[PDB]
């Protein structure tokens, strides 16, 4: 509700007035120095900061600045002073316009006590034209207390939804996280969907993101869909929420294609083959006119700006960043007094940096594609200084940090096509500008005393047309059947990455069945599972993991890996087709071992 509000602080109580703020329309406007970023609560709902002018001393809660009224030189204003422990009083004066060093500002020569800082300044019209900007005491001397406010904004903020529901229409939402968000926009469109009685699907990249949607949509009739279920259908006003990989593995497994006519994919830039595949299908369903869909992303496929916009200002520092352990030179890493996010190209690389900064006495959390859904909640819960992470953190991973150290690198999987066909982990090579923009994205979403900093190294590379994922999604995609007998294609811009012809990867009969199984139960990469299945090898049959050249022998910690089979024999792990991803990290390999023995 609109008006004037006192700002009380306690814990342990405590209870003293720090300043005054103004709620107008639906947004709260007070001084920066009063809250300094701290959250607020009242009779209904908490308040999150989104806009703040650091030096200019003013902050906005629940969207950008809203106060649209200006003072004019030589006039008459009214400071509605809300003294701490005292009743509101209007104070009128003739406000002087004095010289600063930037230019010229208007102010009032009035003195009120600390904890009044942020009282409204009212014009003859009645609309608030500024805030009581302490201070005070400017040279020279006495006062003066500045008439402090920003320029009209614009946009910022705040709704309402365009009719993006009309079938055969696809929308990209260049959502800015920090303004709100899956907090404000997603329930808003979901609500509107139910009113239009549309078969709705929400697609969230990780599980823990979907879990964050679940609560952001508490009350709403929404059912999470376990991937261990081929299809679920209740036949009532219900919104399915699932992981991207759930959607595609369902489209693969079950023949019961539910005819959603609305599909909202959050973080639609995920280049995981499952996600690419999903985007492929959903796109074709839009084309059918059988569906309309929304793709939420800060960096839509195609986008190449490594420095997009943010709701909070980011400093972009370019430096040298270590790849192994360090000693001297790189003190700025350690010297920093705040929470940091660090992107490493691989899990192995991760372990160095951690071990190295662990010596400095820094509480570091490690993140990888597997450990993520088990390690990310710890970044909220426990106290820490450094989260080292792989590029998994590009998918809606929200951290409360101030710095991202991003050596701008990664490993990309590649299929070499000379003699034997195999997948290797190329690099570390430079990331995509999109992926850079995304890593940087983690930072600079909360207004902060110091602007958040993106500390990077090197220029990204656009071309990833040899990435396995694209051709891996093609084989994923064109093994999903449709009731209209149409072959699904890669989604628009993403098409130009695959040089393959449409459908060529199609697997007939119950080879197709194996290909699904290998991915779903045996838990193998798409390329691998494809080559094994299309060889007519049954899912139980494992004796292919032992027929390779000298070259194909898998290694673990510099030693030949030798496994104990189901029928019981020690055999050197030597796949026919070599896919690097199965041994790229211990847990992957550990898991592949279990498969190869027959215990899966």
């Amino acid at each position: 509700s609109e008006g004037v509000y006192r700002i009380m602080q306690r814990g342990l109580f405590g209870k003293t007035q720090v300043g005054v703020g103004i709620h107008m329309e639906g947004v709260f406007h007070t001084m920066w120095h009063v809250t300094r970023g701290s959250v607020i609560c009242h009779e209904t709902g908490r308040l999150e900061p989104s806009w703040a002018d650091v030096r200019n001393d003013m902050i906005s809660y629940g969207g950008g600045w809203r106060l649209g009224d200006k003072w004019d030189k030589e006039e008459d204003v009214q400071v509605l002073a809300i003294e701490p422990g005292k009743n509101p009083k209007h104070v009128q004066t003739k406000p002087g316009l004095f010289k600063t060093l930037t230019g010229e500002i208007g102010a009032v020569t009035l003195d009120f006590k600390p904890g009044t800082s942020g009282s409204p300044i009212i014009n003859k019209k009645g609309k608030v034209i500024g805030l009581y900007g302490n201070g005070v005491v400017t040279k020279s001397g006495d006062y003066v207390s500045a008439i402090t406010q920003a320029e009209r904004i614009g946009e910022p903020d705040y709704e309402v939804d365009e009719d993006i529901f009309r079938k055969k229409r696809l929308t990209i939402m260049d959502l800015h996280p920090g303004a709100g968000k899956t907090k404000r926009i997603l329930p808003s469109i979901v609500r509107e969907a139910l009113k239009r009685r549309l078969r709705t699907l929400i697609l969230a990249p990780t599980r823990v993101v979907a879990a964050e949607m679940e609560e952001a949509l508490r009350g709403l009739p929404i059912r999470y869909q376990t991937p261990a279920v081929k299809s679920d259908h209740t036949g009532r006003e219900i919104v399915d929420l699932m992981c991207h990989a759930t959607f595609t593995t369902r489209l693969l497994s079950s023949t019961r294609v539910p005819n959603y006519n609305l599909i909202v994919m959050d973080e639609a830039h995920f280049t995981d083959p499952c996600s690419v595949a999903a985007r492929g299908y959903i796109s074709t369903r839009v084309e059918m006119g059988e569906a309309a869909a929304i793709f939420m992303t800060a960096t839509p496929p195609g986008s190449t700006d490594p420095f997009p916009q943010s709701n909070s200002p980011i400093e972009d520092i370019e430096r040298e960043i270590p790849e192994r352990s360090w000693n001297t030179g790189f003190d700025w890493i350690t010297d920093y007094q705040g929470k940091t996010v660090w992107f490493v190209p691989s899990i192995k690389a991760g372990n160095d940096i951690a071990n190295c900064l662990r010596k400095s006495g820094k509480r570091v959390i490690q993140l990888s594609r597997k450990t993520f859904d088990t390690e990310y909640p710890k970044t909220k819960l426990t106290d820490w200084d450094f989260v080292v992470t792989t590029d998994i953190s590009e998918m809606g991973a929200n951290f409360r940090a101030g710095r991202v150290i991003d050596p701008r690198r990664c490993l990309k999987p590649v299929i070499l096509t000379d003699g034997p066909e195999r997948v290797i982990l190329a690099g570390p090579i430079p990331v995509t500008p999109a992926s850079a923009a995304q890593r940087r994205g983690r930072i600079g979403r909360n207004p902060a005393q110091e602007d958040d900093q993106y500390v990077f190294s090197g220029d990204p590379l656009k071309n990833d047309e040899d990435h396995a994922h694209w051709t891996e999604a093609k084989m994923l995609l064109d093994n999903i059947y449709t009731p209209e007998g149409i072959i699904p294609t890669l989604f628009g811009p993403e098409r130009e990455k695959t040089q393959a012809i449409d459908g060529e990867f199609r697997l007939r009969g119950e080879q197709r069945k194996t290909f699904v199984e290998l991915m779903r139960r045996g838990d193998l990469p798409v390329w691998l599972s494809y080559k094994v299945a299309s060889a007519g090898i049954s899912y139980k049959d494992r004796e292919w993991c032992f027929t390779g050249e000298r070259n194909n022998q898998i290694l673990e910690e510099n030693m030949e890996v030798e496994i104990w089979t189901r029928e019981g024999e020690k055999k050197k792990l030597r796949p026919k087709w070599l896919d690097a991803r199965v041994y790229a990290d211990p847990m992957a390999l550990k898991d592949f071992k279990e498969f190869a023995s027959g215990r899966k």
Partner: peptide
């Protein structure tokens, strides 16, 4: 949280 609100006033010019 540790900060709170208390509605003390409404915005209007004194005629």
């Amino acid at each position: 949280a540790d900060l709170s609100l208390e509605k003390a006033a409404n915005v209007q010019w004194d005629e």
